[PDB]
């Protein structure tokens, strides 16, 4: 823990600075440091943790996709194979990606989820658990894949169950959870009809609850509703 000597408040402040400077590796390291102080995270701090790691893993996934796309082009008679290089480099990125996912999952397990009693926090962390297992699943193969997929499903499902019981249909965390679980169904679990059903149900139930919201909350909820609708359009 290189961040061990730095004040919790300083780690949080520097995470915000890193965010503004679009230095997401730094931001993630600062928030890891903050998590390791052992205290629960506030709403704002939870967002910083998520933004940081989502951006780091997002970069790695994008790179992995480029390389995978190149790798499969070279692996055929149509195009001269380039040697072991593309595979080696794709595997390097894959291993780094797996390292970041493992780090996040480590944090959630030590001990963010355990200590999260409020629905808002618990659902947030369980959604994250599902997400990072989903990212692991994207690059896994065979039997290892199946267990990872089941771990993602179990985290998402537990999050869903709490969110249905404890949160209104327009709650951004509940919506973001449903959006991501829907993507899981479509892209990971090979269940497009479950993905579509979930996205449509989530959208319709949020729509009927919009009347309760102030204009601020309305804007946040409709944003995610729009992503749900965009995905439905793409999938149907």
């Amino acid at each position: 823990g290189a961040m061990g000597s730095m004040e919790r408040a300083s780690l949080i402040q520097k995470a915000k600075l890193a965010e503004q400077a679009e230095r997401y590796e730094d931001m993630a390291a600062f928030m890891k440091g903050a998590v390791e102080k052992g205290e629960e995270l506030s709403c704002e701090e939870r967002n910083l943790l998520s933004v940081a790691y989502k951006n780091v893993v997002g970069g790695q996934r994008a790179a992995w996709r480029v390389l995978s796309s190149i790798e499969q082009k070279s692996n055929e008679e149509g195009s001269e194979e380039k040697g072991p290089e593309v595979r080696e480099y794709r595997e390097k990125v894959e291993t780094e990606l797996q390292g970041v996912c493992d780090t996040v999952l480590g944090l959630l397990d030590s001990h963010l989820i355990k200590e999260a009693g409020d629905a808002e926090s618990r659902v947030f962390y369980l959604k994250m658990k599902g997400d990072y297992y989903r990212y692991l699943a994207e690059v896994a193969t065979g039997d290892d894949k199946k267990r990872i997929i089941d771990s993602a499903r179990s985290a998402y499902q537990e999050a869903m169950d709490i969110s249905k019981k404890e949160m209104p249909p327009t709650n951004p965390i509940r919506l973001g959870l449903a959006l991501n679980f829907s993507v899981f169904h479509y892209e990971i679990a090979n269940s497009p009809e479950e993905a579509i059903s979930l996205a449509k149900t989530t959208f319709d139930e949020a729509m009927a609850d919009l009347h309760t919201l102030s204009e601020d909350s309305y804007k946040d909820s409709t944003l995610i509703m729009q992503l749900l609708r965009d995905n439905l359009t793409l999938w149907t």
């Binding site: 995978s68 796309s69 993507v183 892209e187 944003l223 729009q226 992503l227 965009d230 995905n231 793409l234």
Partner: peptide, 18 residues
């Protein structure tokens, strides 16, 4: 909002394409 939606559509479409 538009950029977020555009970004999302690109990521989701990649899966469908590949």
């Amino acid at each position: 909002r538009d950029k977020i939606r555009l970004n999302n559509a690109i990521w989701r479409a990649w899966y469908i394409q590949y």
